[PDB]
């Protein structure tokens, strides 16, 4: 193994549309215990986002079908649909815990105190994956991972409040995902709209395609809400 070849392995996996291999390569790179560059950071986040996103899309499709079949009441179909949905669910949860272990043991741990950008990035990742866990959780564990996602999002938001530009894509994406956490997870839409409009208005005074796209996403979220 060799780190440069591992990064080019992640790039090759991306070009080949094999995001499991991409995530594995970036996980090895992270486990080398050396800090990630901005490009390596984005590679890791994109790989694991695509993996867990395939998982989430499959889970949503099967959950829709499961609600329909539950309304229909056929016992055998319901049994099999539920079993498949839970197989997909456990795959999703395993991916999420892999990401969270990488963040707690390697990525967040190694940032120096002046590395506010990396702190915000990795804490946004932590909140995002705890939210992905909350999307499928019920009962007390749902409250558990909801509290964890809230804590990560809050810490990241207060660091980016102070040490990041209102126009920065990481800050805007953190605000977007935090408002989505308020709306879709806690079901407290007023907090979600207040946060999103606060970010949108802090951005207009200071005005780079990613920032433009994230602001467009914030606006579309506010119109859809």
């Amino acid at each position: 193994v060799d780190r440069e070849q591992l990064v080019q392995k992640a790039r090759l996996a991306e070009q080949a549309e094999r995001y499991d291999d991409m995530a594995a390569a970036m996980k090895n790179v992270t486990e080398l215990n050396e800090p990630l560059s901005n490009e390596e950071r984005n590679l890791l986040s994109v790989a694991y986002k695509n993996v867990v996103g395939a998982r989430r899309s499959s889970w949503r499709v099967i959950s829709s079908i499961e609600q329909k079949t539950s309304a229909d009441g056929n016992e055998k179909k319901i049994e099999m649909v539920r079993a498949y949905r839970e197989k997909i669910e456990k795959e999703l949860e395993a991916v999420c815990q892999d990401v969270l272990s990488l963040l707690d043991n390697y990525l967040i741990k190694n940032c120096s105190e002046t590395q506010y950008e990396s702190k915000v990035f990795y804490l946004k990742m932590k909140g995002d994956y705890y939210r992905y866990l909350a999307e499928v959780a019920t009962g007390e564990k749902r409250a558990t991972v909801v509290e964890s996602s809230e804590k990560a999002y809050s810490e990241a938001h207060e660091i980016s409040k102070e040490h990041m530009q209102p126009t920065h894509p990481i800050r805007l994406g953190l605000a977007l995902n935090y408002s989505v956490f308020y709306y879709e997870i806690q079901n407290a839409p007023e907090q979600a709209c207040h946060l999103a409009k606060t970010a949108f208005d802090d951005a207009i005074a200071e005005l780079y395609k990613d920032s433009t796209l994230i602001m467009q996403l914030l606006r579309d979220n506010l119109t859809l809400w």
Partner: peptide, 6 residues
């Protein structure tokens, strides 16, 4: 509809 994230 589902909200957009990034």
């Amino acid at each position: 509809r589902r909200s957009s994230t990034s």
